[PDB]
Design a protein around this ligand. Sequence first.
Ligand code: SA1
Ligand code: SA1
Lengths: 236, 204, 240, 242, 202, 221, 237, 230
Amino acid sequence: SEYDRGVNTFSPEGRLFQVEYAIEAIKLGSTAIGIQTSEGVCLAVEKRITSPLMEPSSIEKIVEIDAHIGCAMSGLIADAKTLIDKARVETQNHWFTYNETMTVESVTQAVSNLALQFGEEDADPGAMSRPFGVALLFGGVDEKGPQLFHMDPSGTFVQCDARAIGSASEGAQSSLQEVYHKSMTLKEAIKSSLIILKQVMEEKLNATNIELATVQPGQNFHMFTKEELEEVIKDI
Amino acid sequence: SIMSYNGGAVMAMKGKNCVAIAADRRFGIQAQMVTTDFQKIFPMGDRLYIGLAGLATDVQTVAQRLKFRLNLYELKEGRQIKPYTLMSMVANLLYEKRFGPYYTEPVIAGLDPKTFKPFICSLDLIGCPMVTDDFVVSGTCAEQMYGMCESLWEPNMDPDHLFETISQAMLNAVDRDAVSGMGVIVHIIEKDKITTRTLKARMD
Amino acid sequence: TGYDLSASTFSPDGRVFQVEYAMKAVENSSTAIGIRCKDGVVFGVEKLVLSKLYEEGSNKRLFNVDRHVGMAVAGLLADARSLADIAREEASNFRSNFGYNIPLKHLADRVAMYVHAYTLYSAVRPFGCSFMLGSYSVNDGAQLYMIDPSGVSYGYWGCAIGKARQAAKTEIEKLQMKEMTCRDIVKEVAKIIYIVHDEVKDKAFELELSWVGELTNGRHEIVPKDIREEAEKYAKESLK
Amino acid sequence: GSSAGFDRHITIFSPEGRLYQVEYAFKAINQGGLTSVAVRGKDCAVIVTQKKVPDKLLDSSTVTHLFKITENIGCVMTGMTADSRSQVQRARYEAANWKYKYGYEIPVDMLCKRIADISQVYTQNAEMRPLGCCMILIGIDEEQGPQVYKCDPAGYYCGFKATAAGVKQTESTSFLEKKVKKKFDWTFEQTVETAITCLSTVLSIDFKPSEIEVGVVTVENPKFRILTEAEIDAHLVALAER
Amino acid sequence: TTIMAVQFDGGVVLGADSRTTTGSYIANRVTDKLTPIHDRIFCCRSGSAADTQAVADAVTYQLGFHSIELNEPPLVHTAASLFKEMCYRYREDLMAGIIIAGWDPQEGGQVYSVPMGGMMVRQSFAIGGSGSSYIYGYVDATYREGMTKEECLQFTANALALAMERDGSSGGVIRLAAIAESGVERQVLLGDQIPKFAVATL
Amino acid sequence: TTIAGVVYKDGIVLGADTRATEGMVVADKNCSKIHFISPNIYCCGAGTAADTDMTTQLISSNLELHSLSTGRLPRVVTANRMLKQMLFRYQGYIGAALVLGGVDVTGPHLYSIYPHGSTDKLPYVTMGSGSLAAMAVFEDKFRPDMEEEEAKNLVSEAIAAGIFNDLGSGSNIDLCVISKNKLDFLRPYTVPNKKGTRLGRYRCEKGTTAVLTEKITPLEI
Amino acid sequence: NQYDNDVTVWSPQGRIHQIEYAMEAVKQGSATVGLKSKTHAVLVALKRAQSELAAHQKKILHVDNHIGISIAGLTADARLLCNFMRQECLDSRFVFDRPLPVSRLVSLIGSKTQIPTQRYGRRPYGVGLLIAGYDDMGPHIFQTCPSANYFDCRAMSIGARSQSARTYLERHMSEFMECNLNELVKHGLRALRETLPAEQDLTTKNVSIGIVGKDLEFTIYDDDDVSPFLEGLEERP
Amino acid sequence: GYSFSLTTFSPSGKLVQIEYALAAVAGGAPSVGIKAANGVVLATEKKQKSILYDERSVHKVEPITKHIGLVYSGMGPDYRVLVHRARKLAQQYYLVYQEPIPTAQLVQRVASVMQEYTQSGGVRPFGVSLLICGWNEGRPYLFQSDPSGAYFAWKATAMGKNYVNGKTFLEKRYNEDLELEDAIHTAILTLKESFEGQMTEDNIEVGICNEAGFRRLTPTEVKDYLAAIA
Ligand SMILES: *C(=O)[C@]1([C@@H](O)[C@@H]2C=CCCC2)NC(=O)[C@@H]2CCO[C@@]21C
Ligand SMILES: *C(=O)[C@]1([C@@H](O)[C@@H]2C=CCCC2)NC(=O)[C@@H]2CCO[C@@]21C
């Protein structure tokens, strides 16, 4: 049966069942890769296009949180829209109150506070019934430099140097282990991430089935156009 | 006074097996006349009528809410409402707004739907019912109507004499009030017919 | 069959098994004792130390509910603390409304009703604690009441709660406590505590003592250290 | 005795139209092992209950099932002790509120009706259980005389000439039926004698003044009274010299 | 209105006038301003008739419930505290000056004053109302310690009569109550029972 | 308005006038100011007519509910408590001044209830604008334990004093006699005022009124 | 099992299985040690994350100028409790202009944590806490369990394989009261080293320190700041 | 409280809790109602278990207004709840319309109350059926309301134990030109058809509605009628 247990039930091993099941939902999504360098943050994701009749330009796996912060998402993409709206509202409220930009860590923390706010009773109307089935990669530039953060449905957020999320995370993570060093340039990071994404994708990597974005000091959030993408793809 | 903002006069009179209800026709904002065909007498049944005097917005509001309640009553009960029951319903509606009053005073005139006995009553600002065997008046020219009705009314009048009496009373009373007039309409309610007449009046 | 999963369910023979399981929770706890004499009340707790890393005064099982009222608990300590807060709030409200210190019988009745409210519904769980309330005043004298997880409150001359309650009661019945003084009662309480303790299963323990009477001017307090150590000496001598 | 669903776990109907949880609540009254008898007379009403103090460490004053609802209404509770205390508190509140709202003392029958109305809600709503207690009320009504009323966990309430509650209710009912059929308009002494004799006979115990509690109400003194040990001993020595 | 309470060894004596006024018209001329709150506890009400009646009824309800739950006779201080709580909480809405007098086994006979605003003070004698102003010097000159019940009754009657002579809002009959352990005794003084004081004539 | 009430040896006599005014004009000449509460309790009302009407109806319904529940005859103190608690709740914004008279198992009871929630239990009471004129008659001629006819004459005299000396009171005199054995609701009891005879016939003849439009609708029976 | 899914259900043995399952969450987490001298209080935390790129997760949090906490178990519950504690201390400063005593804060935490264990459809807080504080009564180390029970400790370790650390601490606890700051911190570091598998060692990356004392606000030493303390630490046996 | 329904639909399309409530109704004490030309008679059996029961305490025949009366079969506490609801509803109607409520209107409102408990959260249906008598517009009315919330208009009917046999008896003995005394005799005969023991004036309860109103018969009157029947 499905309703023997409540949503806030612990396992005999000490884990919330619903969170574990949502983390398993994370494994069914597309592969996103994030690399942090002293020159900025690179985010690359794969569009999982099922039909030739689908227009790939309506698949938004990378969004702009603010001019200095972008997000890459994996899993149940419809669930991610609430978190992203919260993040955008938080950054704009911070600008309104303090006349400055938010740090990436604060945005990640604000979004992570929503993650375990689910239940059935003793909760206000309009509360959530289940966890979120999304993993998020936040990339931005603040006074501490280029920052990359990872968030999973449990509410845990960490800071990472290089990170892969999605279905092919384990192999992609091993490859990132092999290729990451602290002195990488952003061009090298972009090339390395595209090499790994090509390795893990079940399709053939062309300029319409992937997304790439960068955040650099001084330059805003940039989504690569098709022409720049082809320029990078030529080397691979 | 907020009652005198739009003016208006309604009167009901009792006969022998008949009732009569008369009203003025002016709609105006204080001293300016806007229209001369404003409805102040509404049918609440085949032989039952209600006349409303006072603020025109409350007149229309009260008529529409009363029809709401009456229609629901007649659907649930499968009967036609008796005049006394309608009096109680109107009193309840008006007293629900005791501290935010509707600025209207109603008169009810009708015949009992089974025994065909005349009924007339009046209600004040908040719903104290007044049942009379002679006549009831309401509006800005109430004193004038009282004088005319006390002088002219006789018991056991046939429909024609009742029409003459109520017509004379209304005409001569509204001729002495500035914010009332511009025509008079009379309804004579009998067992077998309703007769509606418009009177030749002063339009100044 | 699932006749024992809710507090809003009777069994075919007329029992609420959830309250009985809460009582089982109380029976696993270490023993607390209360003895009443004409001039006061004395409370003694066997407090097991589960590690040497714990400070002296950790996991107190004796509380001050009002300046004249003291509380000795057994069972689940978190439930006991929440109940202590409920009792404190009851006493405060009584003083703010009626203007004097709450009588102990009234306080016990109010707290017992609050405890009973948790034995009726599926939405809440019964309390896993039992406790004793003790007080002294000139008008009312010395009072000792006990409350169990079902909500029953009774007045006692000597009471014991926890794992070794029966043996402790046997020992308490050997005292003519009505014509004793609070000083003698402290030594007898310590002696009984040392008798009922099982060194083989339970390793080590502290003795927690408190009292309320005319000796303390109707104020509930911890027994002074010298009296406590003298009583412990008497108890250890008696065990040979 | 069929079942379908959760009809033995919550207060819903069984295929035969029964409520099993109410019947189990009736079973709960017998847990406690006590018996009470109430008898009505010409000018008096008497309640006699069994008093058991297993511990000599118990303060005997606090072990009581006789309670005072108002100055003129008294009750004896049978069954689960905490539930009984809850119902006593509810009854006291209702009587006080009646006096505040209507300006005169509550009749006994109306108080029993209010308590039984409260009990009915527990048999219709599924999230709460019934209370495992029975309530017997005695009073004097200045138009009808002595009044003895009883309410049970099902929501039934009734007025009686004599009644019993507890473990030995059926035997006590038989004894009292025989006594009432041979009708003597009972004096105060005869009423107390009848109650004490019923309890003794059905329990097979010769009572000591400390083993019973007696509570009386009379037309001459309408206030609810609890008898001291000396008065009970007077009645017992009179019963023995018979 | 004129209300008074005096404490003697073993009890209290309360006294009041019997006039209700709506302006300059006497609506009730035999009113009872002494209210039994409990068996041995009474209140004298001053101010708004409706407000004082409502407060007295609420306190009677609360005190009866309290006494049933505790199985004890109530204390006079408890009744004064309930009055103080209600009068302080609704001080913006209520016009009520109360005197609470009574006997309890623990403290004996007690007199408490709850003026408008909701303060509570224990006094050996208390006076209140609009006529109380005219007898302040008389009670200060005549009060002595260790009076008996009969002397207290005479003293209260004299003061109330003096107040009723000079105040247009006080008059009628004098209502007296003596509260002790043995119970309550109530008296009415009317006509020639009311003490007379000679009027100056030229 | 003049309303009055006395206690006599066997019960209650209540009296009232029958005039209702809107300002200084007479609106109703046959108003009934004695309201039914229970078969043994009646009420005389003064003040705001709608407030009096609605308050008495509400309390009458509540008392009927109470009597159905208890199976006993209602008591006047219950009505008194209900009315004064309701009126105190509204802080004097319900303008009802009431005389409450009944006979219960404890005897004849008469109360005066004021719009702010104040109550007085008295052997004779008057309320209204003509209250002082009635109270003069009561203070001059009242004796305790009167017979029914003496009490009826006294209440009639007090209402008449209100009628002839107050501008807000007039018309007829209504009475209600309540004992344990009977109830007498006497409308009208005396008629002190009548309308003079008319001396002229104001030509009422057909065709005097000029008509512009006419519509006749036949109704089916 | 019908007794192990709800926090409102008692077992026939007199236990609540959900609370024990919640304590398992603390047992799974990374290990932390806490100890106090007569003047200072030290929290040593073993930071770790999933991978080497993933920076070691934050275990020591700042609550107030006189209070800090270490975490074991569910991090989101830990942040909920941290925010509650911060607000309570701020309210105390707003109303009374003084710091909140540490024992009263632990009492408030225990009150907060007990409520969910009595209500249907709620869960315990799957977090174990170690609180270091300084107030007018000296330095304090407190332990908080998911069962809503709290303890006042001389020293304490919680987390995975923390029994070995507790053994080490019991052996050496008589010294702690008379130590200076560096000696106390080194004692804590040795105890924390007792939990690592025999190959692993203590580096500047996986160790966080938190210190409070008579004249020092709560400080978190991470990275290069911990090099002064890791110096002069003998190799494991 | 529970926010979900305890009465749901079965695969065959039945609301089985309502059927089990009807089973509770069919086990209760017999009730009879007859509509005469000049009145209505409601009769019930109150056979107490013991002589210790005081017969004047609880009544199964109750007045709702001056002209409306009630009787029941099933579970008594639920009957008391419904009686309180009906009296309140009649008082609300009187407060609004200044008229005593018609019998059909009362039946419809009470049946709405009974329907609410077949669909609301956390409750069971009422285990009682009701017979309602009234006099409106110079005409007598008799109605039956069942646990589901459905109401029927009857000339004569029976409820409770052996109600099918009572129905056949009433079919054979009913007539349009019955006057109230004949109707009372017929109702007592219907009750006798299913009675154990001797019928006395204290183990049956009768109430009548005529132009004067609804009233409950005193034991003396019932003794007179029982002497006439025997
Ligand atoms: C007295 O203060 C007074 C009384 O009417 C009133 C009567 C009932 C008991 C409380 C006191 N209150 C008043 O408002 C008038 C004016 C002055 O004194 C009054 C007579
Ligand atoms: C009497 O007080 C009076 C009447 O309208 C009276 C009020 C209550 C019952 C119905 C009729 N109330 C008034 O406002 C006028 C002014 C003086 O007396 C009135 C006629």
